[PDB]
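As promised in the previous annual report, we have extended the structural survey to additional targets. Below is the entry for Beta-xylanase.
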Amino acid sequence: AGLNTAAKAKGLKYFGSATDNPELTDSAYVAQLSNTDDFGQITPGNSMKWDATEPSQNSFSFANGDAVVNLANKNGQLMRCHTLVWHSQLPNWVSSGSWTNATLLAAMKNHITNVVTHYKGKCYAWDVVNEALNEDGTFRNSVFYQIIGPAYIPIAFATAAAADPDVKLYYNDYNIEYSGAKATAAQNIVKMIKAYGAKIDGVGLQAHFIVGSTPSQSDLTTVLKGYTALGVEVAYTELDIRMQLPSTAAKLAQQSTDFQGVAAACVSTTGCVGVTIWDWTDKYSWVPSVFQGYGAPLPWDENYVKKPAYDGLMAGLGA
Ligand SMILES: O[C@@H]1[C@@H](O)[C@H](O[C@@H]2CO[C@H](O)[C@H](O)[C@H]2O)OC[C@H]1O
Ligand SMILES: *[C@@H]1O[C@H](CO)[C@@H](O)[C@H](O)[C@H]1NC(C)=O
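The corresponding structure token record, generated without further manual editing, is:
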């Protein structure tokens, strides 16, 4: 009957979607987000990030994150929880701080423990560290890397695992879905976390792709299997396939095949537990405001009508 039923028929745990709190007032939107034929899983796009959950040091704020969890709960949908440690969407107090390793570590760990404990039992997975890599596979020079060094990564994982030993702990990034230095470096992150003795369960592959320039199914699959070989699971976490505007029939058809290969790569890899799209309607995509001249990235259009990419996903899921 839909993306989520099809995914689960093939052994995935879910097909899901991100959302954000302003969208939850739109009844037609909510009705489709709440359609469990299509979505068995939800990710909050913004309300579990650091700025949203710890706007001042030791002063936590969960209303907006909780409202997304309550909608998934109402629907019987799983949650992915996103994201504990990331260089973006930090509150001023983190980015402007005069830190030592000891004082930043205490603040980071306190952030993790409080947010993960708050959501204990409520998340299928956490994206514990997000976007820690440069494109060449070096570490991104965030505040956390500059002050703490590489250890911030395993320390973050270990702190999350202490707070909630059951939730799947993921490393999440973009441009780690195709073969190259960045994906190799993401494998090396998995290895490093375990060499520290810390827990990592999954690799999250954002999958912000471009129509006509999407990784092939074969390379996607090689990359997925390069992570599952390490003894972790994998998921596509933020799938969207942005097109160079204007939209045309031919671009919409290409977009379909591009989405199809992503779904099919996940099915083909035992250990790929699911796909989440970064919202589901073009109306609410983050893409146009960030990638100038691109848009129409999702399987429904801006009036909530299915595009050819819906069918491409269904075909890649073998439905
Ligand atoms: O802020 C980051 C964006 O930079 C990231 O942009 C990448 C750039 O490389 C490719 O173009 C990839 O397709 C895009 O998504 O996307 C995640 C976001 O948080
Ligand atoms: C910060 O402290 C931890 C020990 O808590 C350590 O693993 C790491 O090397 C330190 N980093 C730096 C840059 O001093």
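The pocket of ligand 1 is lined by residues 174-175, 206, 208 (CB under 6 Å). The chain is about 40% helix and 20% strand. These points will be discussed at the next consortium meeting with the crystallography subgroup.
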